[PDB]
């Protein structure tokens, strides 16, 4: 059974694997989707929001009464917000002043203080403001693109969950790369801790194929395509890099809801699009492909994902 969780941060993870049935029709491989939308604040980032806070508590970088600050325009802010609300830390998030009002309302519902930075300055301006605030005594900055506790929580939770739920039947792991923590930690766990052969595939936007050595660019696949190679991405455990267009990411996310009853975000379609291409290769006939679906469709009502439904 599950334990009684002493606060909501302890309840991260333990997400289900769901077999894909219609998008895979005609394939002889098996595609399993890990539903990271079923987390305490409904994304994969909940794992690293909890883990980065716990890690800083253990090392003494974060003490009761201190202030947390991070620049993030995505799910990491929601993850830090619910953790800090659960564990009692004041949290400040910096982000470009063009962040949607829907995301800002979610953040403020956890009591996060929002510092908007000029929109022309983009993410660079939010990063600069956060680093300035973090330099104040009493302030802690998790640094999602550098913190080893990010991939470590995937070694400790996401990876074992995949390994154990599949009873060791996982031949391919496909993951969109934002920070790279998910793919890094799951691949480290499978290849290094369990000594298990697995073909590890990173997915990035065709419009911003930086892992493959291409130029950064603007794209609509929220949560991946950072525009740089993050320190938390360990290329030495990744076997292949696939690119996915914005349109096929959006379309595949729509098809996951329509054909499988899985309501998920745009990057879920990006990951599934790459997974389905790998799963169709004859050399994986009879093999099991696992992919991560980072969050839930409702967080995307005002985005391109729902343009076709007004």
């Amino acid at each position: 059974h599950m334990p009684i969780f002493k606060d909501n941060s302890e309840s991260i993870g333990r997400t289900p694997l769901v077999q894909i049935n219609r998008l895979t029709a005609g394939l002889s491989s098996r595609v399993l989707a890990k539903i990271e939308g079923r987390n305490p604040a409904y994304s994969v980032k909940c794992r690293i929001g909890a883990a980065m806070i716990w890690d800083a508590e253990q090392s003494g970088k974060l003490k009761p009464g201190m202030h947390v600050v991070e620049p993030t325009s995505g799910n990491t802010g929601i993850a830090l917000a619910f953790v800090c609300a659960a564990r009692g830390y004041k949290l400040t998030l910096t982000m470009p002043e063009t962040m949607s009002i829907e995301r800002r309302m979610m953040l403020k519902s956890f009591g996060a203080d929002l510092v908007l930075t000029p929109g022309a300055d983009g993410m660079k301006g939010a990063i600069s403001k956060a680093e300035e605030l973090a330099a104040q005594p009493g302030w802690f900055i998790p640094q999602q693109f550098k913190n080893p506790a990010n991939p470590a929580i995937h070694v400790k939770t996401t990876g074992p969950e995949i390994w154990n739920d599949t009873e060791g039947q996982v031949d391919v792991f496909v993951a969109g790369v934002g920070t790279g923590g998910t793919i890094t930690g799951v691949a480290r766990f499978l290849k290094h801790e369990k000594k298990h052969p697995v073909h590890v595939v990173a997915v990035e936007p065709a419009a911003s194929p930086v892992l493959a050595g291409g130029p950064a660019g603007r794209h609509k696949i929220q949560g991946i395509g950072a525009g740089f190679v993050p320190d938390t991405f360990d290329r030495s455990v990744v076997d292949e890099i696939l690119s996915v267009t914005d349109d096929e990411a959006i379309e595949t996310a729509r098809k996951l809801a329509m054909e499988e009853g899985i309501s998920c975000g745009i990057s879920c379609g990006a990951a599934m699009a790459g997974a389905l291409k790998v799963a169709a290769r004859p050399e994986f006939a009879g093999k099991t492909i696992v992919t991560v679906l980072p969050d839930a469709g409702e967080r995307y009502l005002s985005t391109a994902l729902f343009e076709n439904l007004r």
Partner: peptide, 8 residues
Amino acid sequence: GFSGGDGI
């Protein structure tokens, strides 16, 4: 359009 860590 996301770049430079935007959206994560």
